[PDB]
Ligand binder design. Structure first.
Ligand code: CLA
Ligand code: CLA
Ligand code: CLA
Ligand code: CLA
Ligand code: CLA
Ligand code: CLA
Ligand SMILES: CCCCCCCCCCCCCCCCCC(=O)OC[C@H](CO[C@@H]1O[C@H](CO)[C@H](O)[C@H](O)[C@H]1O)OC(=O)CCCCCCCCCCCCCCCCC
Ligand SMILES: CCCCCCCCCCCCCCCCCC(=O)OC[C@H](CO[C@@H]1O[C@H](CO)[C@H](O)[C@H](O)[C@H]1O)OC(=O)CCCCCCCCCCCCCCCCC
Ligand SMILES: CCCCCCCCCCCCCCCC(=O)OC[C@H](COP(=O)(O)OC[C@@H](O)CO)OC(=O)CCCCCCCCCCCCCCC
Ligand SMILES: CC1=C(/C=C/C(C)=C/C=C/C(C)=C/C=C/C=C(C)/C=C/C=C(C)/C=C/C2=C(C)CCCC2(C)C)C(C)(C)CCC1
Ligand SMILES: CC1=C(/C=C/C(C)=C/C=C/C(C)=C/C=C/C=C(C)/C=C/C=C(C)/C=C/C2=C(C)CCCC2(C)C)C(C)(C)CCC1
Ligand SMILES: [Ca+2]
Ligand SMILES: [Ca+2]
Ligand SMILES: [Fe+2]
Lengths: 176, 60, 243, 112, 30, 135, 95, 31, 169, 39, 31, 30, 56, 56
């Protein structure tokens, strides 16, 4: 049912083109990235606080000192990526801020879609294509995909409507 | 476009490995938010209400 | 060509080259007054492409401009079968029957304009002058050929408009949908003129080779725009079944 | 110092300057109302209330004046399709000018 | 001419990257 | 509703004959169809030539009509072109050529009758039967 | 403005089998036509009139009889190159 | 391309206004 | 509401033309999908006149009849659909005509079905169209509800719908 | 090589009166030239 | 009126760029 | 719409006047 | 220069039409006041094609 | 066409594009790298290198 909702939003609202969904995607992917990179950075800058090859038992929740080297982490990431966190508090606040901001922006976009206020089209490209039959972008291709999805899915997805689309009105490419 | 055609041809949404990827990214964002928020919530008081609490941490 | 295998030919470009006869070749193919001889593996290799640019001034010479092929070694007609009939007076009539007798070709012009055209020899009928009792270095088959529309009637434009399929309007703009001239697709049948000058005849093996020059229209993109004039110069080869 | 996102907390314990910033916000909002109405008036097409009513013209504040009884212009027309009515001072123009003058007075009070 | 606007914003982003790397605030231990 | 007797009642021969498959006959016919005919006739379509599908209109339009069970069994013994002019027994699976169609050398006459009956019963359960390849 | 195929659907071409424009699939409803006789008819097009479909060179007695039986379903229109070019009367991209 | 006639000015201001806000705040810092 | 007004006029004895000419242009204008607030776009800015144009006049009510006398209803575009196939159904909800995407197996096209349209009231009052191009364009118009002539030159209107102040608010 | 603090760096100043004068100048230049920019 | 299409953006920038220059310099003064 | 630009620049000038008067740097004797 | 070319053509025996048809369009284009640099305006911006149009 | 820097390239011998055309009216010429595009790209790369040297 959720997958259906997802594809419905693509086909009818062109939700992927929506800048607010784009910011949501960025927030979610960035949150996952931050999760992975922070966990790995901490696990690979740990202090030698025990004798086992098992480094998990060299931590104590009441210990006062840092369990990993922020200095070494910062140097590593400064030389690898060009920049690095130097403030632990800022790092963890950023880890909060990124996915939460993403969720909020995508929610704003969904509010727009509730009123069919879509970022469905780029009018300039639509006009150029309507006049110039050689103008093709990935945007216009996606528009065509959306048209196909709507026509083929609506009768089954909206059975209360009693949509009757005879076979000959269904859009389709050659041989398929 | 890549994504839409990929779904049309392979039904990636109904592929469990993509389901696991979604769990990976949703959960990674969840755990990022959770960890960041718990650390930010449990910050030791080292600043005043005027300056950023970030200045409570000194590098190194 | 030569006498190798597809393994020796693959990925060399040799597959796009029309076979060549020899150097010490000035033979002639005697022909009966009123009989027709099959032509077996007729090949045309284009080498030069010119597009007649259209000045905005008026009334001034257009000056064919040399283009460069953007499509790769996919420009040659081959395995074409046809016939040559010898007239009552002595005239020679070449008639293309079938084979791989078309290639879409795109040439780039100076200025960045791209010219697709449907390079073909389809239904070519060509004639020489009367008084030919042989096929020799003076055999010039001048004739006409058809040029089908570059895009078939099953083609869909980027807004899924087509001739026997697709929308008849601009659906992305519901209140202006019927406003566009390109909402009507056409596939007019164009006309080209070809000349096949025979320059080298190996009468024992039946092989004839020569030069060709053809003049035809370019793609109109289903009648969206006016056709340019494309001239193609190249070489041709074929085998004439004497028996 | 204060992070950017905390600058306004300087009026948190200053009732006089809290009143000041509230006055300035009120002045800005009233000035927006006045200027928005003036703009809509400068571009409103009043000739055809039938097939070109206000909601076809992107008119955003005009319907809100009309909802409560301000439906005529000084310029002779009314959004009900009539002409030659006399609204008095309380026309669209009068209301917009009232908001502009109110914006100014609120600005001055905020400064004080 | 909108191409100019796209190129401008892209260049601004890249320039910000270069300065944030080359001219960063040094991390200092104290 | 159930897979009732009327639903399992199908034309037997061209002279108005009628035969009812049992539930077991229908189940064996479906099993055979899925095992050997689903590779080329999924949902009544013909992947290698969809001008000749398994739909009711296509089946009845052949020469002779193949919309009855005996004609189907005859086709499966001796496949022919749609106008019944050419011999397709080298091109279509049939029990008459086990040397080239080994997937068929274990089928009885009961099995062929069952699969023909299934071919006749399936269209009325599925409006997609015998349509366009992408449909 | 209809392009050219839609104007064809305005004519008899849109009501019955046109011997000069119909696809080979369109002969399937004529029992005994697809594929052999249908291919023969398309091969020996164009026809000025319907009756010359009986004058196809090399025809056979049973095919002759089938043509005479189904003459009523046929029409002849001017050959539109849109429906003819590319061997679309054999395979117009419809499966 | 026939683009929205407010596109350039909207884009320029959308970038420039916060850019100058940040620039002001940064430059005056330490005053 | 429009249909009920027309039917009351007919119940008096008024003709189709008279009954439909009684319908106010404003009421018909409400019955046009381009005035639904659910047809716009987030970045389709400005007045609705910037979309379809400034409405000039109602063209009158079309009535589509096929070749056999069946009177046909064009299925209107729902709010959801950015595009929608043209379908014409008879009284008992059976498709009698359409505009086919693929034509080689088309059976219900306006060309084959002989659909014609006659207009009642409005600018086209009393006019009947049989040219299939005309019928098809008017069917596409009926998809949007009541038809209107538009001035698209004043705003350089682009052809895509805007939302109303109701939607923006 | 080492990065040494440059001792040639000096503060820049614009007093409030200079601010008002420059802002008025810019505003009046804009008033003057806008009509010609629009043409 | 059919005015030069660059008029608004030119006017806005002609004013805004020196305005922000002055604003920056003024605000940071005393740092 | 150029009228908006003219009104904007005129308003900017007048606002500058008001601030330069009301919020001036006091002349101080010292 | 144009007049001299025309007069030489006429001195050969060419007709008015022939003599004047010998004149290149580029040379005549130089002889048009809209191509003088002293006809513009300070706030008439852009290409000369933005003025009289593109010469055809 | 309001072309301001193009004449200055052409004055010193850069008169052809990579795109096939030349300001002398000809087509199909091969300027090599030193076309209008090549010269402009040279100036861009030079600008970058000078920027880097300035930073140093
Ligand atoms: C109520 C809202 C809701 C809920 C409950 C779910 C739940 C789920 N989604 Mg979904 N989804 C939603 C809204 C929701 N979704 C929306 C609005 C969208 C966009 C339209 C999506 C798009 C989406 C996609 C594309 C996919 C999912 C998937 C999933 C499954 C994996 C979740 C996951 O690991 O992520 C991260 C969460 C964690 C890492 C924390 C664990 C959360 C678990 C489920 C809590 C359960 C605890 C326990 C079992 C409860 C019992 C109590 C206990 C004491 C016994 C999961 C069952 C995947 C799927 O379908 O799997 C089969 C998948 O591919 N979702
Ligand atoms: C009546 C409404 C209202 C009021 C009076 C306040 C007041 C305050 N908020 Mg708050 N807030 C509100 C609504 C409100 N908020 C809403 C709706 C949200 C969710 C978006 C928030 C989320 C929020 C957070 C996370 C924080 C505050 C903070 C503060 C304090 C400092 C504000 C500051 O200096 O930022 C200054 C802002 C700038 C210098 C630039 C902001 C530019 C914005 C993003 C765009 C401006 C657009 C335009 C001018 C505004 C029109 C919008 C309007 C129609 C509503 C202050 C007491 C801060 C605080 O708690 O301090 C200790 C703080 O961290 N607020
Ligand atoms: C006497 C002063 C005055 C008058 C007569 C008006 C009159 C008008 N204003 Mg205006 N305005 C004023 C002052 C005034 N304004 C001030 C000071 C400001 C700055 C804040 C504004 C800002 C403003 C804006 C932004 C707009 C107007 C608009 C309007 C027009 C429509 C108003 C409307 O819809 O009301 C709507 C008001 C409400 C629905 C009141 C909501 C209050 C809630 C429901 C109550 C809150 C809860 C309650 C306090 C708790 C329970 C108590 C209960 C038990 C009793 C109208 C001509 C509109 C217009 O047409 O523009 C030209 C418009 O958009 N004004
Ligand atoms: C809620 C208040 C509101 C509403 C409902 C409207 C509604 C309307 N206005 Mg508007 N207007 C408003 C406030 C409002 N206005 C204000 C405050 C101003 C002063 C600037 C204006 C000045 C104005 C003018 C000059 C015009 C209108 C016009 C219109 C009409 C066209 C709407 C349109 O296309 O907008 C388009 C909406 C968008 C393109 C959405 C923009 C969304 C932004 C980009 C999101 C920002 C993203 C953010 C940065 C994300 C943060 C990142 C994260 C990390 C935090 C419409 C009826 C037009 C009209 O037709 O007049 C007759 C018109 O000419 N208005
Ligand atoms: C001297 C150098 C120079 C020269 C001769 C040219 C010449 C030309 N350029 Mg230009 N250009 C230049 C530098 C130059 N450019 C620079 C540095 C840039 C980068 C911004 C540009 C970018 C550019 C573009 C984008 C375009 C041109 C175009 C053109 C052509 C149209 C000219 C025009 O209308 O301008 C108009 C000139 C004016 C309106 C005069 C403005 C005078 C100002 C307002 C005076 C300022 C007053 C000052 C504030 C007073 C101070 C007050 C006091 C108290 C101190 C023309 C051949 C156009 C073209 O046709 O290209 C093909 C075009 O599109 N150029
Ligand atoms: C090897 C490096 C190099 C080369 C081959 C070029 C080549 C070119 N440049 Mg270029 N340029 C360069 C470096 C280079 N540049 C650098 C480092 C800059 C930044 C300053 C520029 C900035 C630049 C601009 C702004 C322009 C060019 C332009 C051009 C083109 C025309 C140049 C021209 O007219 O010259 C003119 C040069 C002179 C007339 C020299 C004047 C020097 C005076 C006369 C001598 C000074 C007195 C002397 C020193 C004292 C007496 C000594 C004497 C006794 C010997 C040409 C393709 C033009 C172009 O076409 O743009 C695409 C153009 O407008 N360049
Ligand atoms: C310094 C101070 C100034 C600061 C400016 C900051 C600028 C930012 C850049 C501009 C952003 C908006 C550009 C819109 C694009 C455009 O061209 O609009 C163009 C429109 C005008 O649109 C024009 O209208 C004309 C008729 O008046 C014609 O119809 C034209 O065809 C049409 O283009 O301008 C507006 O719409 C302004 C109002 C926008 C607000 C309406 C929505 C209110 C609610 C918003 C909710 C947002 C939530 C975000 C949350 C997260
Ligand atoms: C931040 C950084 C950016 C800062 C920007 C500062 C902006 C200032 C405001 C712009 C001022 C110029 C606006 C010109 C009006 C306009 O629209 O131009 C518009 C023109 C372009 O003009 C357009 O051209 C097109 C073809 O390319 C078409 O022909 C159009 O019709 C035409 O409008 O832009 C320019 O001309 C830019 C070049 C201007 C310089 C040429 C003169 C050089 C010498 C100047 C001597 C000045 C001396 C002053 C001394 C005191
Ligand atoms: C291989 C080396 C070359 C690197 C080239 C790749 C560039 C990557 C450099 C990072 C850019 C700096 C951005 C943050 C600016 C900056 O300097 O931040 C510096 C900052 C250092 O934080 P501190 O802990 O020192 O700060 C704490 C306090 O100062 C709080 O302000 O790092 C972060 O905040 C990490 C989170 C942002 C990570 C941003 C990554 C964005 C990726 C690029 C996105 C733009 C691409 C657009 C393309 C058009
Ligand atoms: C961007 C954007 C946005 C925002 C907006 C805003 C927020 C704005 C605004 C606005 C405004 C807010 C405006 C305003 C205004 C105003 C005015 C126009 C005023 C005035 C005035 C006056 C003129 C006064 C005067 C005076 C004085 C001063 C004193 C004395 C008295 C007098 C009267 C003289 C949003 C989010 C929506 C979204 C979209 C985009
Ligand atoms: C306003 C005005 C004016 C002025 C103007 C000006 C002065 C301007 C300008 C301008 C300019 C001055 C511009 C520029 C530019 C630039 C560029 C565009 C660049 C670039 C670059 C690059 C891209 C590089 C890169 C790199 C690097 C960085 C390093 C490594 C290498 C490389 C290459 C990678 C005048 C007075 C005339 C008058 C009118 C108005
Ligand atoms: Ca098998
Ligand atoms: Ca057909
Ligand atoms: Fe952590």
């Amino acid at each position: 049912g959720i997958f259906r909702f997802i594809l419905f939003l693509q086909g009818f609202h062109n939700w992927t083109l929506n800048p607010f969904h784009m910011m949501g995607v960025a927030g979610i992917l960035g949150g996952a990235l931050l999760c992975a990179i922070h966990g790995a950075t901490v696990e690979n800058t740990l202090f030698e606080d025990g004798e086992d090859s098992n480094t998990f038992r060299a931590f104590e929740p009441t210990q006062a000192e840092e369990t990993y080297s922020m200095v070494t982490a910062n140097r590593f990431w400064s030389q690898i990526f060009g920049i690095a966190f130097s403030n632990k508090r800022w790092l963890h606040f950023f880890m909060l801020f990124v996915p939460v901001t993403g969720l909020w922006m995508s929610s704003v976009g969904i509010v727009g879609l509730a009123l069919n206020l879509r970022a469905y089209d780029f009018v300039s490209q639509e006009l150029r294509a309507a006049e110039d039959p050689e103008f093709e972008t990935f945007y216009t291709k996606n528009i065509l995909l959306n048209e196909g999805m709507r026509a083929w899915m609506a009768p089954q997805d909206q059975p209360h409507e009693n949509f009757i689309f005879p076979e000959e009105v269904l859009p389709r490419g050659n041989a398929l | 476009n890549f994504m839409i055609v990929f779904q049309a041809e392979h039904n990636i949404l109904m592929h469990p490995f993509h389901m696991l990827g979604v769990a990976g990214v949703f959960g990674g964002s969840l755990f990022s938010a959770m960890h960041g928020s718990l650390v930010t919530s449990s910050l030791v008081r080292e600043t005043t209400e005027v300056e950023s609490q970030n200045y409570g941490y000194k590098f190194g | 060509k030569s006498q190798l295998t597809y393994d020796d030919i693959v990925n060399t470009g040799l597959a796009n080259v029309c076979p060549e006869i020899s150097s010490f070749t000035r033979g002639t193919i005697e022909v009966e007054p009123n009989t027709k001889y099959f032509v077996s593996d007729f090949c045309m290799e284009p080498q030069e492409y010119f597009v007649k640019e259209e000045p905005v001034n008026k009334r001034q010479k257009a000056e064919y401009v040399k283009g460069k092929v953007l499509t790769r070694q996919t420009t040659s007609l081959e395995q074409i079968r046809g016939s040559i009939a010898v007239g009552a007076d002595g005239t020679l009539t070449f008639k293309e029957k079938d084979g791989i007798d078309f290639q879409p070709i795109t040439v780039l012009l100076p200025g960045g304009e791209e010219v697709p055209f449907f390079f073909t020899v389809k239904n070519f009928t060509g004639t020489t002058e009367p008084g030919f009792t042989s096929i020799n270095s003076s055999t010039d088959f001048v004739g006409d050929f058809n040029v089908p529309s570059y895009r078939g009637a099953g083609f869909l434009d980027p807004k899924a408009r087509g001739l026997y399929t697709g929308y008849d309007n601009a659906v992305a703009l519901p209140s202006a949908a019927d406003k566009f001239r390109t909402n009507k697709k056409e596939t007019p049948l164009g006309k080209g003129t070809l000349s096949l000058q025979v320059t080298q005849v190996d009468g024992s093996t039946g092989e004839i080779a020569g030069i060709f020059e053809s003049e035809q229209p370019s793609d109109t993109d289903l009648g969206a725009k006016e056709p340019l004039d494309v001239k193609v110069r190249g070489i041709f080869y074929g085998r004439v079944d004497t028996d | 110092g204060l992070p950017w996102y905390r600058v306004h907390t300087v009026v948190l314990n200053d009732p006089g300057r809290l009143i000041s910033v509230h006055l300035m916000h009120t002045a800005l909002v009233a000035g927006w109302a006045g200027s928005m109405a003036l703009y809509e008036l400068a571009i409103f097409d009043s000739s055809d209330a039938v097939l070109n009513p206000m909601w076809r013209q992107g008119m955003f504040v005009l319907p809100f004046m009309a909802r409560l009884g301000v439906t005529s212009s000084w310029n002779g027309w009314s959004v009900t399709g009539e002409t030659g009515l006399d609204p008095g001072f309380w026309s669209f123009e009068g209301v917009a000018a009232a908001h502009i003058v109110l914006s100014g007075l609120l600005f001055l009070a905020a400064v004080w | 001419m909108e191409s100019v606007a796209y190129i401008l914003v892209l260049t601004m982003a890249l320039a910000v990257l270069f300065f944030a790397i080359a001219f960063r605030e040094p991390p200092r231990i104290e | 509703v159930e897979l009732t007797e009327s639903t399992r009642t199908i034309p037997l021969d061209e002279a108005g004959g009628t035969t009812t498959l049992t539930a077991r006959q229908f189940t064996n016919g479906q099993k055979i169809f899925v095992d050997t005919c689903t590779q080329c006739h999924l949902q009544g379509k013909t992947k290698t030539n969809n001008n000749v599908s398994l739909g009711l209109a296509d089946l009845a339009g052949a020469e002779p009509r193949r919309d009855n069970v005996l004609a189907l069994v005859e086709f499966l013994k001796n496949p022919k072109s749609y106008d019944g002019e050419d011999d397709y027994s080298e091109l279509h699976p049939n029990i008459s050529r086990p040397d080239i169609y080994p997937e068929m050398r274990n089928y009885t006459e009961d099995d062929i009758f069952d699969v023909a009956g299934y071919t006749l019963i399936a269209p009325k359960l599925d409006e997609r039967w015998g349509g366009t390849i992408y449909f | 403005e209809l392009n050219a195929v839609d104007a064809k659907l305005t004519t008899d071409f849109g009501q019955k089998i046109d011997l000069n424009n119909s696809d080979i699939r369109d002969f399937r409803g004529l029992r005994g036509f697809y594929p052999n006789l249908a291919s023969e008819i398309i091969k020996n097009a164009p026809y000025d009139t319907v009756e010359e479909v009986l004058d196809i060179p090399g025809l056979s007695e049973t095919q002759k009889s089938r043509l005479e039986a189904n003459l009523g379903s046929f029409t002849v229109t001017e050959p539109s190159i849109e429906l003819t070019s590319g061997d679309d009367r054999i395979n117009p991209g419809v499966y | 391309m026939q683009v929205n006639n407010l596109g350039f000015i909207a884009s320029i201001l959308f970038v420039l206004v916060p850019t100058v806000f940040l620039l002001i705040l940064f430059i005056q810092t330490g005053k | 509401e429009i249909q009920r007004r027309v039917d009351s006029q007919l119940a008096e004895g008024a003709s189709l033309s008279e009954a439909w000419s009684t319908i106010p242009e404003k009421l018909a204008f409400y019955d046009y999908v381009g005035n639904s607030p659910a047809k716009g776009g987030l970045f389709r800015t400005g007045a609705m006149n910037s979309g379809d144009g400034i409405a000039q006049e109602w063209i009158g009510h079309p009535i589509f009849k096929d070749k056999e006398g069946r009177e046909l209803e064009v299925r209107r575009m729902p709010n959801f659909f950015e595009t929608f196939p043209v379908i014409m159904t008879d009284a008992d909800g059976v498709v009698r005509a359409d505009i086919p995407f693929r034509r080689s197996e088309s059976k219900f096209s306006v060309e084959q079905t002989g659909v014609t349209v006659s207009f009642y009231g409005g600018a086209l009052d009393g006019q009947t169209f049989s040219n299939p191009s005309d019928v098809k364009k008017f069917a596409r118009k009926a998809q949007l509800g009541e038809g209107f002539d538009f001035d698209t030159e004043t705003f350089n209107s682009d052809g895509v719908f805007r939302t109303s102040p109701r939607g923006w608010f | 090589m080492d990065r040494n603090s440059n001792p040639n760096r000096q503060p820049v100043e614009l007093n409030r009166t200079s601010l008002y004068l420059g802002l008025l100048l810019v505003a009046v230049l804009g008033i003057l030239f806008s009509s010609y920019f629009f043409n």
